[PDB]
Amino acid sequence: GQVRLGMMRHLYVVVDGSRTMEDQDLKPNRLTCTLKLLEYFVEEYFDQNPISQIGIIVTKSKRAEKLTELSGNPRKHITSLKKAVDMTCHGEPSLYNSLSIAMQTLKHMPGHTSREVLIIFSSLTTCDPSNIYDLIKTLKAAKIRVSVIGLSAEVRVCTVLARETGGTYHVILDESHYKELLTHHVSPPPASSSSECSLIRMGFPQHTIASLSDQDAKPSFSMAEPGLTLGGYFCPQCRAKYCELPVECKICGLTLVSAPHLARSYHHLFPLDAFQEIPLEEYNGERFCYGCQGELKDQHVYVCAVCQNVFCVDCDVFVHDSLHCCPGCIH
């Protein structure tokens, strides 16, 4: 797509902790497989979108539990998922309370954030304690976006929630299909005609080591069991002390960016194109791969659009998944 995308993205993951998480349709029980692919999901989402954040709610026993708050580093989330392997999964879920906690945190994120909730939902009895069409009207008006990945069935309420809030609903066959669905929700989904297109004020703090062998330095502890920090990253608004970048400013409200973290997600904006895939021999006067200078010992030859060079299957998967550019069009 050559369309607008939601690139600052407070996503918020609601997992079941239902009775139906313990069912053994997957190769381990559904809790374990779901949680493993969420570990992979947090990994690839922070690997691809650096500005954004994640928060994890386990929904358990008709109540909702904010298990890990909305933050932007994979260590705390994957640590909490390694903890949450050990849980119990007792009771029926509650879609009302989980969407209420996600709404309560996602009211006051600024308007340019595509505020997104991902409900990995298994069971069928959606045991709410109040009316859940007024929530869907509120979340429609609060311009949030909720997408539900479903297990074993299609449920009408999750269908109405997905088609009305703006999201997308999907049901799971396999391990591989479920990986394809979570990979589909890694990428930034396109925006509606409703979300604000603002201009967030940003800060670009340089790295600062202990200045000249600590000749008149500023010895600090940290800012969020810490040692004595000699130097590091400052802030251009409040002049505090941060170890890691990118981190939202804990005492100002500025967002702090190193700016390859803007360059880590530039491929969404000037995207790739399609490779013309042709299996047969077909006029090939360029026998060797323009990717890595090797022969084409199979019957799959892939030719670009603009330069129209030659690529094999290995160069196809590598260019379209990782390098994200044609090596010909750079030249």
């Binding site: 069928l124 009895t125 959606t126 859940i132 479903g150 009408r156 309420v157 999750c158 049901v171 066959l173």
Partner: protein, 304 residues
């Protein structure tokens, strides 16, 4: 004209009737769209039936409740459960309470039992349709004779799994049955055991075949007792349901049927968009003018 009429050999043989066309139209599909299973085998390998003639047999009602429980745990968005008689639904939902079953069915979905009031049935239907849309799971269990299954139709997500409990035989009624059967022996030529099977199957397949509206609707439709596998009773279901009744599905267990339901719903909850139909189960403007399509439509329809 009806969606179910089977067999068509008997409506000229009752109505003093000689038609021009006796036609049956085969369900041509690009996607399985339905699966009927005959769950005629308990989980204890108890033969599921209703041979007792409404005087309760305990283990068969136990296996009916086990079927409803596990099919509740699998199916989304509303399960419709047709019993035989209101005395039998009365007795069954009685002995689903003293026996510890019905609270578990409550834990999975919300029941709406039927009564023979004209207004209480309408309120139970209205709450059943407001519970298939406000998140939770709803399950309407009724009688396969009354007005619940005559007009009140169950569309895309109101009934996913029509559970036909038992074979519906008119058992309560008097010598009107014996006398109409003596008449159909004498002055028409239609047998006893032919007309009873015809009447039972037109009621059963009448109440089953309401779940499906279009090609983009999917309805699990289970038949729960062993008698629907016995050739004459299966032979009088319509052709568009016998076409999708596989010999493996014939006489499944409870749990084999539950696993077939799971595989059914998972293979049939994916994006089945309009672009998957223009070949097989749909026709455009210009897909009609081809004479190959005319040969296809010659091959679909048949007569009796």
């Amino acid at each position: 004209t009806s969606g179910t009429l089977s067999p068509l050999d008997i409506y000229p043989k009752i109505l003093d009737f000689h038609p021009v066309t006796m036609a049956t139209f085969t369900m041509t599909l690009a996607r399985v769209c339905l699966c009927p299973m005959i769950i005629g085998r308990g989980n204890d390998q108890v033969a599921i039936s209703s041979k007792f003639e409404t005087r309760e047999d305990i283990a068969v009602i136990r296996n009916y409740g086990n079927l409803l429980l596990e099919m509740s745990a699998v199916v989304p968005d509303g399960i419709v459960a047709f019993f035989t008689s209101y005395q039998y639904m009365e007795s069954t939902v009685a002995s689903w309470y003293e026996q510890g079953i019905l609270e578990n069915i409550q834990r999975n979905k919300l029941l709406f039992i039927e009564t023979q009031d004209g207004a209480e049935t309408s309120v139970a239907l209205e709450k059943y349709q407001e519970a298939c849309e406000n998140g939770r799971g709803a399950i309407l269990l009724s009688v396969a004779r009354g007005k619940v299954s005559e007009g009140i139709d169950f569309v895309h997500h109101y009934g996913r799994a029509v559970i036909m409990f038992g074979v519906p035989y008119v058992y309560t009624q008097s010598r009107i049955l014996k006398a109409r059967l003596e008449y159909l022996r004498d002055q028409f030529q239609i047998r006893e055991n032919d007309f009873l099977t015809f009447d039972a199957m037109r009621h059963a397949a009448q109440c089953v075949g309401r779940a499906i509206r279009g090609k983009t609707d999917y309805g699990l439709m289970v038949f729960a007792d062993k008698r629907f596998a016995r050739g004459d009773k299966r032979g009088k279901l319509p052709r568009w349901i016998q076409e999708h009744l596989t010999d493996a599905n014939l006489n499944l267990t409870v749990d084999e049927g539950v696993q077939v339901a799971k595989y059914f719903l998972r293979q049939m909850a994916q994006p089945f968009h309009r672009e998957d139909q223009l070949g097989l189960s749909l026709l455009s403007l210009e897909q009609l003018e081809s004479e190959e399509t005319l040969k296809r439509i010659e091959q679909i329809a048949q007569q009796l």
